[PDB]
Subunit: 267 residues, 4 copies
């Protein structure tokens, strides 16, 4: 296995179409031993993760909760056994209140809503690194999920701002993680049809937003020299595993694009 | 004058070494009629602005205050006369609590502090545009101040994250401002010895931070093919005026670098 | 005038729809004294430039000719009067053999053809700077024309490669020009309907190429928050003049986008 | 092995300190079957490659020779057996005449010299893809070696221009390779002490150039959050293998940085 022998924490599973679900599956398929973290709906998450090809302890983590973060490393050591450390950490967490996205005008998102989304989507990447670096091995790897924010786009609005912040946060985390011999990188994925995304295409955030996202997705597949399949999260999961492995040992504070190559093409 | 006939709002004056002070002076020298906004220390700001070559009404604006923002456009119309509109807006506002900068570890900044700094330094750019676009003329120009955050740097820490967010916010504001025939751009300046900056070089934020900033400044002048004078804000002020003029009419959602060309050179 | 008192060399006029024609007109309108250079069809170019609002000496310059380059500075001093120096230089020159563009497959362009196009389109920017820097004043400005090559696009093929090279060349020229107190920058323009461009939309380079360029142009106007008018070179000409003026005195080795803001937006 | 079962062509071995030598070794260690190409000194190259952990046919390829390129695919099919196709191609080829580098002024490089270097260093990436795509399997991978040219640097001069061109060429090759289900990417490596590099540090290209390169190398290790060891090409070789594997299946037309993370940090 690509990840034979590695212990890896994976956050952000909420359904079987979560990107993190597929990351965890591929990791296990490749020999990794996992510990999982979940937010709020733990009974639901345990039931969902029963389907992973191997068993994995599930810990609760609300990244807005300072007590969960304070105790996190202790709980992970319990789950993996004293004297053992993590080789990998996957941050697959994101959220923006509805007022910060969709047909709600960009200017009408209240700061308290934006702030919550930046807290969960960007700041928390630093939070998790802080909690977990003290229990990671040299040669370890932290990975977060990015959506390319270098240009503005319809509908995504404040979530795109949050991703811009996350990319900057990642460059600082690399500085800190480096002292532990640990790498920190983001994977910028193409659009993937998770439950939330389908809901949005379905009009959950307004009809104009839905039309624009659908148009965004189609342009993506068209631009990608190898195509893009929004229904298949597997190529994204493999890329995260590549970064978790020993095969990109000199890459840190960086962004790997798993997007079909769409971002390298104009038309 | 470059700005003959234009009405321009300029925020962010707090001392005579403020970048906004120099922006206002050059603007007046070039024919602009100004309205100013100031935060908290209004008696002090009025006394400082008495030195500008022309008189200009001073309005109070705390960008964290929804009532100031709600009433802002009304107060500006009063100051410039009903039936008159702004041709320009200068956002020169920034702040990060001390815990988000300097030798205080990156991981130790509490979210409430980071959030305040992102509110003032990034979100407020959207806030001001929202308040002011309804009273701007076609062909108008909004300009904000940026410090190039595309790479991590010592000491600047969470302020750099805030600037990453601001750059993303600027691209969205351009989308909105475009409907009014208005441009939105940032100026990325080299480091300038304002009062705060000198204090930091002096060790106000820890000795290690001060040493790194001083080293940052020296490397800048060295890399800049035309040099960089941290004691002279004038070349920055001129660049902002260039963007306020009619001479960059097809540039928007963009960043103009006034940094001596330092960012284009590695060594 | 924005350029009152400045002496400026402007290359690249071949017809009245040339971008350089419009650059020269706006410059003269703003007080500049011009010297022009033309390639090959000098009788035609003189007849075209008779229409400029002021008279200007026309010198012959084939940038592939080492003797023209060797003698250039001497001929310019003759035209503007001994003891006088240039304040500005405009490089508006570009060419790629047909085999390097359009429906001719990317892989089928012979190196000799690509090389000719890189010579004229990229190397020559360094050539002109070398010839002219010895006769420029401190505070001077060199400007070249760019088409944003950071992403691949249909049809433009090897010309896009040439522009990638030009951007890199510009960063080096800034290093050299800096010793003379001279700036060097590119303007990245949106697509403009010159004679060549219309011919291409008309199918001169194959029907598939024409269809793609037309589609490129439409997407541009759509993405640009302030729109893009491919039939109007004026906003581009003004931007070049902005860079020729004293109003961007700390910008060098850089790229200014005059493209309606299209490159800052994804959809 | 990471590359179990894959057939891979590797160019650019000239000594045992060549980056391509280390790429080939790691590939073989990971299960790949190799075919090698060499330029000019074939007796020397065969003797050097005898040290690889497995045997591999050596073919002659001068990328400036149209007959070598025309016959290349035929010769590779012979070496790997009719009915067999390549899964991978490594372009590790670069050259710039001495006049285009070092203390020789940037402006003094003659175009014929620059052109030769762009031919070998940039155009040839397209040349090799053209020759080899007809004999590659779906899911295949082409990889080239890059040195980050996004900013100008002392000494590297026209070689940096060549790399700028190569990055642009790579984005076009991805467009073509995509039709075959093949990816195309570059690896941007930190500086590595090959024979040529040591010679340059030793003053082979002038003392000023040597001093600047040495200073470049030191700054690199300092900026890299995980450090950079210029004497160890292994982390670069692993990264190339990562791209040759099935573990980055949605990345194309892109650049992966194997540079210690140096390019993500300012100071
Ligand atoms: N779906 C896409 O098209 C797309 C594309 C690129 C990147 N991404 C990113 O990938 C990541 C995963 O998203 P997804 O598409 O798998 O969506 P998802 O809804 O399946 O998962 C998002 C996860 O974030 C968790 N979360 C929300 N608030 C939390 C908090 N307070 N504490 C802990 N966890 C919290 C949710 O429980 C959920 O598990 C996100 O960062 C997203 O921005 C998504
Ligand atoms: N000084 C530098 O080296 C440097 C470099 C590049 C960019 N910048 C940016 O330029 C801008 C101006 O900074 P400066 O260097 O002139 O510093 P400064 O201290 O002189 O001005 C900052 C201004 O922000 C104002 N401010 C703070 N909180 C506010 C709030 N709640 N509401 C309204 N105003 C508020 C302050 O009153 C002050 O006037 C900032 O955005 C800064 O980040 C500074
Ligand atoms: N038209 C567009 O959509 C567009 C967009 C962005 C940038 N540009 C760039 O603007 C510049 C001007 O192009 P244009 O659109 O005005 O086209 P144009 O055909 O009007 O002008 C190109 C000029 O280059 C000159 N030239 C060709 N070979 C030469 C040589 N050997 N020596 C001296 N001059 C030579 C021609 O005489 C002509 O005057 C070019 O660099 C072009 O790439 C064009
Ligand atoms: N050494 C570094 O610090 C560094 C850093 C980043 C990228 N790179 C790149 O890595 C690649 C390999 O370089 P290296 O450092 O291993 O140097 P090297 O000298 O060991 O290898 C360069 C190879 O290019 C070959 N070559 C030259 N002309 C050729 C031609 N006409 N046809 C076929 N082959 C030809 C040479 O035979 C040699 O094998 C180059 O592209 C280089 O630019 C090098």
């Amino acid at each position: 296995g690509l990840l034979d022998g590695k212990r890896i924490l994976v956050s952000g599973i909420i359904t079987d179409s979560s990107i993190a679900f597929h990351i965890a599956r591929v990791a296990q398929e490749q020999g990794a031993q996992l510990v999982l973290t979940g937010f709020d709906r733990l009974r639901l998450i345990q039931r969902i993760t029963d389907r992973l090809p191997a068993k994995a302890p599930l810990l609760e983590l609300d990244v807005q909760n300072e007590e969960h973060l304070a105790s996190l490393a202790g709980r992970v050591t319990e789950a993996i056994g004293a004297g053992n450390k993590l080789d990998g950490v996957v941050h697959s967490i994101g959220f923006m209140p509805q007022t910060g996205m969709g047909i709600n005008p960009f200017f009408d998102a209240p700061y308290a809503d934006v702030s919550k989304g930046i807290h969960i989507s960007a700041y928390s990447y630093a939070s998790m690194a802080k909690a977990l670096l003290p229990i990671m091995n040299p040669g370890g790897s932290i990975v977060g999920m990015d959506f390319d924010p270098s240009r503005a786009m319809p509908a995504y609005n404040w979530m795109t701002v949050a991703k811009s912040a996350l990319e900057s946060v990642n460059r600082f985390v690399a500085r800190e993680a480096g002292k532990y011999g640990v790498r920190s990188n983001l994977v910028a994925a193409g659009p993937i049809r998770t439950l939330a995304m389908s809901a949005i295409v379905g009009g959950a955030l307004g009809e104009e937003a839905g039309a624009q996202i659908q148009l965004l997705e189609e342009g993506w597949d068209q631009r990608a020299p190898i195509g893009w399949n929004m229904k298949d999260a597997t190529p994204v999961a493999k890329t995260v595993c590549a970064l978790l492995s020993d095969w990109l040992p000199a890459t840190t504070g960086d962004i790997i694009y798993a997007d079909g190559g769409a971002h390298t093409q104009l038309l």
